[PDB]
Design a protein around this ligand. Structure first.
Ligand SMILES: CCCCCCCCCCCCCCCCCC(=O)OC[C@H](COP(=O)([O-])OCC(O)COP(=O)([O-])OC[C@@H](COC(=O)CCCCCCCCCCCCCCCCC)OC(=O)CCCCCCCCCCCCCCCCC)OC(=O)CCCCCCCCCCCCCCCCC
Ligand SMILES: CCCCCCCCCCCCO[C@@H]1O[C@H](CO)[C@@H](O[C@H]2O[C@H](CO)[C@@H](O)[C@H](O)[C@H]2O)[C@H](O)[C@H]1O
Ligand SMILES: CCCCCCCCCCCCO[C@@H]1O[C@H](CO)[C@@H](O[C@H]2O[C@H](CO)[C@@H](O)[C@H](O)[C@H]2O)[C@H](O)[C@H]1O
Lengths: 108, 52, 133, 112, 226, 37, 207, 90, 140
């Protein structure tokens, strides 16, 4: 009854697992993670092309959140990393366009 | 002049600078005196890119 | 407990070390020159066992002799079966994915392209822009 | 083979890490930034200018000085969308069902 | 209504987040197995280090009661350390979760007095180790600020390097140990400051004539130095 | 009134000692750049 | 000063003095009152010790700063030279600018003095350091000019500098006000606790 | 921002919905909806931030710490959110 | 228990190690030309070192030389009582207090923008879920 939260936390765990398996030289584990990285979400799939064409304040919010979560720059040559990054950004974009983010500590 | 001599009087990269023992030189500085000041009797120079 | 990469560590490491693995694909099999065939469009006519087993296990858990792992497994199988049709609907309706569906390309064009020249990361702006200087 | 890195070589380990199956952009590691002072500084400057808390919160904007975006997201757009469609349809590419698109992207990006 | 159905893909698909979880849950997807990080390296207390200290290898004493079991650095590491990333390297010299010598003050004035006397700082006691990404973010922000301060300065990269070494050595939780490593870059920065000052303000000296035996051997080359 | 029955300065925030200075022919805590032969 | 420890029995009393009859309602109520009193005393001690420690520490800090001849945003130092005071008041409240009466060398010297002072005052963690240094760098660039021509060029940086300045001033004012309010609330609460303890001691019973 | 305020906001939402009807509620009751959601969100943040920060720390450290072992790091957060919801919306 | 200690290690001379001392070494003695050179300089009016002048021109701030019984042994001492400055506001920091646990802007900033952003993302996702629940409840 909390699919958004559940899938967010799961994707984060899977990113961490991919990083750990890369550090420990484990192709089997990292491919297992990549396969388990929730690719069958219609909402994120529909938001993907919207994020690929967004611009301005919404894009800046989403990029700020994605830098908060995953600040390390992925290699511009690794399509798996690129795709996981795109998927996470699309998920954040969906969450934002449903209910925008409030990133400032000052708020009321 | 040193940079031009290194790069053959051709277009050098951007923001290239010289250092000795970790200390950056100004482009309008004499190499001999800069070495005398920063790396005395250790003239090993390094060319790096200063983007920062 | 560790399974050493070099059982003969003093000798093996020298003349036959292990390279960094490649995970994008196997690299030992041929490269397909054709895309995958479009799988049949799904529907809710294939959720029979998923739904019935989820119901059974949820009842048995409400009793207290089932557990939670089985519940999660069954629910996720059923949810995958539904997400199949959801994704099919999205792909067939949304127009931005029609090109992706009928996308085709060959290794020769891939090697002949020249977009790799522009894959350089940018540069973060100056911190003085925060104060507007 | 992979020998221990003493504590004195960690600063170089941070900006020149060893090779891995999933490496970062070492040339861009000095460009990864995330300012924790963005909003505090913004509020301080605005309140010094003379605005109120509400005006400051309405004028606030997220930081643009963050880690740059991957150029692949703009150059390999169509190939990435096709790969993601393949994954969504084929359960994440199990048993090499998106090798086609993945290899096309890899070739485009690497060029031998 | 079950809790957290779609939130444990690691459990549904046997994906281990680390070799420890792999060994525990028996997924067996790590080809090289797992060498457990012992407890003396997973947790522990701050210890004295110098051999010129009488209480060497003994836990540090605090005003509050503290478990005296110390964190033991890895002194005899195995030859193969497959993961040579900062994540796996930092565990040989610090515990990722921080030391186990943090206080729970019964009152606020005890905290006040400890701080006033220099025996407590939350920055030092209630905290974990810094991740490589955090270290890099901090270093890059500091470098940007220094460059904005003065681009035409020679000791800029030296200051950046001492900052970097402090961050890498975790000076927040081991200030003395980290200063022991970064005082060298501090000294180099001091030297560069003097050098820049003497180049700006023309300061030179009368050099004496060349010595009669400047060359040890006549056939030896007298390489000229500025 | 008993609040002022006892303030010269304050205790030092940090301290530096001689044993904190590194030493060693091989110790890399003393090596910044190689010294010429 | 302290009292001597209380006297103890010389012969060992183990349990001979224990009660042989259960307590009564009045004794139970007296025990409850004793517990209330000890809680009140604990609260009072916390307040008093915090107040005492903070007062001592802050007076010591003030004496140390006065001993080392420090000056802050609130210029409350009498041992300052008039020139140093003018320069600091220009950096804090006014506008640093070189006068046309001076020669170019003296203008360079004045700007160097400003820069040295401000860099010793503000560290890299300080927000106003970058705007201040930028404004002084603009001054260095525009030395060989008049104030009228220099304003148009340096205003864009002086604006940010003044903004950070006023921000710090407002921070200081708000800190003073909030600390006063919190202190007064705590003291009032302590006084009320003391009166409650007084009435409970008038009601206490036993010997 | 408090539990009382959030509960009052949800009561306003429900009464305005009963007034409007099942057909025009989503169009006529947007502001009250947003206010109620924001109040409930402030409550959730205040009452479950510790668990969120703990999960963030575990994710940063790759779930290598002691408190990150098992599934408690996630179950605690989910349970806190469920409790907050069950305390607010009904 | 440190003074007047016993011989803790052995003293020895290894076989055939040289000594470099002749038999008249005890009658030998040292000598420095510095005293005679100073006398000669004073008598011939040769250039004096600037250390003879107490005032120090080697810096901008006033320094005066303190001599230890001879012009050859001196240390410069600064005269100024330096005024120090702090571009800092007072009462804006309480380091003893752990601020990451208190709720507020100061708390979030003692924490970081990353934690605050993560909290906001969780907030948004939770709001999505609760909106779905509200819809399914009020539609009934
Ligand atoms: C098998 C190999 C063959 C192939 C050869 C290959 C090699 C070829 C290359 C050559 C070798 C080069 C190798 C490198 C050398 C580097 C190392 C080195 O040299 O120093 C190491 C070595 C290291 O020592 P050290 O600890 O480092 O100290 C260094 C000091 O700088 C020095 O230390 P020191 O100063 O303390 O030692 C000096 C010592 C010795 O110094 C001297 O004595 C000066 C030399 C004077 C010689 C002439 C006087 C002879 C008198 C003889 C008369 C005796 C009575 C007659 C009896 C006849 C019947 C037996 O002084 C004393 O011990 C006390 C004597 C003080 C009095 C001296 C002055 C008075 C002289 C007159 C006597 C008057 C007495 C009056 C008494 C008072 C009365 C009132 O140096 C020495 O030991 C120096 C002395 C060496 C003496 C060796 C004894 C054997 C000598 C014979 C050699 C072979 C002879 C061959 C035949 C020819 C003779 C017939
Ligand atoms: C026709 C020209 C004269 C032909 C004869 C040349 C003979 C020269 C060899 C003599 C030995 C020189 O050895 C050494 O070299 C030069 C002088 O030459 C001196 O060098 C020093 O004084 C000279 C002044 O002339 C300076 O330029 C030099 O910077 C300084 O190092 C040394 O004090 C001397 O010790
Ligand atoms: C009772 C009778 C007394 C008789 C007195 C006789 C006095 C004779 C004094 C001669 C002293 C010469 O002293 C020596 O001379 C040479 C050149 O001449 C100097 O010069 C030499 O060394 C210096 C540098 O080392 C350079 O000038 C140069 O490399 C070389 O020419 C020496 O620095 C000096 O040490």
């Amino acid at each position: 009854s909390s699919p958004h939260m559940d899938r967010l936390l799961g994707d984060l765990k899977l990113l961490a697992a991919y990083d750990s398996a890369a550090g420990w030289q484990e192709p089997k584990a990292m491919e297992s993670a990549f396969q388990s990285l929730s690719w069958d979400d219609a909402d994120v799939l529909k938001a993907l092309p919207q994020y690929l064409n967004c611009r301005g304040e919404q894009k800046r919010r989403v990029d700020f959140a994605y830098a908060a979560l995953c600040p390390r720059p992925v290699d511009e040559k690794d399509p798996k990393q690129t795709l996981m990054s795109l998927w996470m950004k699309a998920r954040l974009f969906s969450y934002d366009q449903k209910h925008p983010f409030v990133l400032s500590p000052f708020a009321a | 002049q040193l940079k031009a001599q290194i790069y053959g009087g051709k277009a050098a990269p951007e923001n290239v600078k010289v250092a000795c023992r970790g200390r950056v030189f100004e482009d309008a500085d004499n190499v001999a005196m800069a070495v005398r000041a920063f790396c005395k009797r250790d003239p090993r120079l390094l060319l790096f890119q200063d983007n920062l | 407990v560790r399974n050493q990469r070099y059982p003969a560590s003093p000798v093996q490491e020298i003349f036959l070390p292990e390279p960094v693995p490649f995970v994008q694909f196997d690299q030992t099999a041929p490269s397909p020159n054709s895309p995958p065939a479009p799988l049949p469009s799904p529907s809710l006519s294939q959720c029979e066992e998923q739904k019935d087993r989820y119901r059974d296990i949820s009842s048995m858990f409400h009793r207290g002799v089932a557990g939670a792992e089985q519940v999660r497994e069954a629910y996720n199988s059923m949810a995958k079966c539904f997400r199949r049709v959801s994704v099919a609907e999205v792909l067939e309706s949304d127009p931005a994915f029609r090109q992706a569906r009928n996308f085709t390309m060959d290794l020769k064009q891939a090697e002949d392209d020249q977009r790799y020249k522009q894959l350089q990361y940018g540069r973060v702006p100056s911190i003085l822009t925060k104060y507007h200087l | 083979a992979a020998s221990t890195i003493p504590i004195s070589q960690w600063p170089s380990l941070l900006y020149a890490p060893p090779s891995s199956p999933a490496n970062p952009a070492v040339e861009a590691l000095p460009e990864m930034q995330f300012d924790d002072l963005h909003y505090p500084r913004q509020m301080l400057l605005c309140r010094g200018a003379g605005y109120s808390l509400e005006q400051c919160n309405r004028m606030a904007q997220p930081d643009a000085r963050v880690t740059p975006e991957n150029p692949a997201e703009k150059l390999l757009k169509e190939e990435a969308v096709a790969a993601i469609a393949c994954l969504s349809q084929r359960e994440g590419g199990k048993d090499e069902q998106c090798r086609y698109y993945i290899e096309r992207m890899y070739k485009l990006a690497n060029k031998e | 209504s079950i809790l957290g159905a779609e939130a444990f893909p690691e459990l549904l698909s046997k994906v281990p987040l680390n070799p420890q979880m792999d060994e525990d849950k028996h997924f067996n997807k790590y080809k090289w197995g797992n060498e457990p990080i012992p407890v003396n390296r997973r947790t522990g207390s701050r210890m004295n280090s110098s051999i010129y200290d009488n209480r060497n290898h003994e836990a540090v004493r605090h005003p509050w009661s503290t478990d005296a079991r110390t964190f033991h650095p890895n002194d005899n590491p195995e030859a193969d350390r497959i993961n040579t990333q900062y994540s796996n390297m930092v565990s040989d010299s610090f515990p990722e979760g921080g030391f186990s010598d943090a206080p729970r003050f019964s009152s606020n004035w005890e905290r006040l007095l400890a701080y006033h006397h220099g025996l407590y700082s939350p920055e030092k006691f209630n905290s974990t180790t810094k991740t490589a990404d955090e270290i890099r973010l901090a270093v890059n922000d500091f470098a940007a600020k220094v460059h904005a301060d003065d681009p035409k300065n020679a000791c800029k990269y030296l200051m950046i390097e001492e900052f970097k070494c402090l961050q890498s050595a975790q000076a927040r939780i081991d200030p003395q140990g980290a200063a022991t490593k970064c005082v060298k870059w501090f000294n180099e920065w001091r030297q560069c400051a003097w050098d820049q000052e003497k180049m700006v303000k023309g300061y030179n000296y009368i050099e004496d004539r060349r010595a009669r035996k400047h060359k040890p051997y006549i056939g030896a080359p007298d390489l000229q130095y500025s | 009134s008993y609040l002022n029955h006892g303030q010269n300065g304050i205790p030092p925030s940090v301290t530096w000692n001689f044993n904190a200075m590194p030493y060693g022919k091989e110790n890399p805590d003393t090596k910044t750049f190689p010294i010429p032969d | 000063t302290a009292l001597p420890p209380p006297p103890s029995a010389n012969v060992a009393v183990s349990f001979t003095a224990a009660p042989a009859e259960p307590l009564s309602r009045g004794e139970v109520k007296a025990a409850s009152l004793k517990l209330e009193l000890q809680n009140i005393e604990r609260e009072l001690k916390d307040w008093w010790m915090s107040r005492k420690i903070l007062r001592d520490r802050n007076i010591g800090l003030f004496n140390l700063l006065q001993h080392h001849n420090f000056a802050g945003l609130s210029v409350n130092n009498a041992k300052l030279s008039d020139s140093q005071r003018v320069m600091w008041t220009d950096l804090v409240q006014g506008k640093p600018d070189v006068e046309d009466k001076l020669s170019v060398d003296a203008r360079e010297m004045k700007v160097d003095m400003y820069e040295k002072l401000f860099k010793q005052a503000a560290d890299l963690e300080n927000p106003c350091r970058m705007p201040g240094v930028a404004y002084l760098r603009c001054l260095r660039d525009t030395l060989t000019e008049t104030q009228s021509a220099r304003r148009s060029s340096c205003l864009n940086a002086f604006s940010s500098f003044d903004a950070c300045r006023t921000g710090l001033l407002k921070q200081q004012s708000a800190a003073v006000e909030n600390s006063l309010v919190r202190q007064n609330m705590a003291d009032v609460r302590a006084k009320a606790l003391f009166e409650r303890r007084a009435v409970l001691l008038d009601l206490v019973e036993g010997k | 921002m408090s539990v009382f305020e959030a509960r009052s906001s949800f009561l306003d939402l429900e009464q305005c919905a009963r007034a409007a009807g099942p057909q025009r509620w989503e169009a006529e009751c947007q502001g009250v909806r947003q206010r109620a959601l924001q109040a409930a969100a402030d409550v959730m943040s205040r009452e479950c931030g510790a668990y969120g920060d703990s999960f963030f720390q575990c994710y940063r450290h790759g779930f290598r710490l002691e408190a990150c072992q098992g599934e408690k790091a996630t179950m605690q957060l989910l349970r806190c959110q469920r409790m907050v919801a069950d305390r607010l919306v009904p | 228990s440190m003074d007047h200690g016993m011989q803790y290690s052995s003293i020895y001379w290894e076989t055939s190690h040289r000594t470099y001392l002749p038999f008249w070494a005890s009658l030998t003695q040292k000598f420095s030309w510095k005293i005679m050179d100073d006398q000669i300089r004073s008598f011939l009016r040769l250039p004096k070192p600037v250390t003879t002048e107490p005032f120090v021109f080697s810096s901008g701030s006033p320094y005066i030389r303190r001599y230890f019984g001879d012009a050859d042994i001196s240390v410069p001492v600064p005269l100024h009582a330096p005024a120090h400055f702090a571009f800092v506001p007072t009462g804006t920091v309480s380091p003893w207090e752990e601020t990451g646990m208190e709720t507020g802007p100061q708390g979030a900033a003692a924490r970081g923008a990353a934690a605050t952003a993560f909290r906001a993302v969780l907030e948004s996702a939770w709001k999505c879920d609760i909106d779905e629940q509200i819809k399914e409840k009020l539609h009934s």
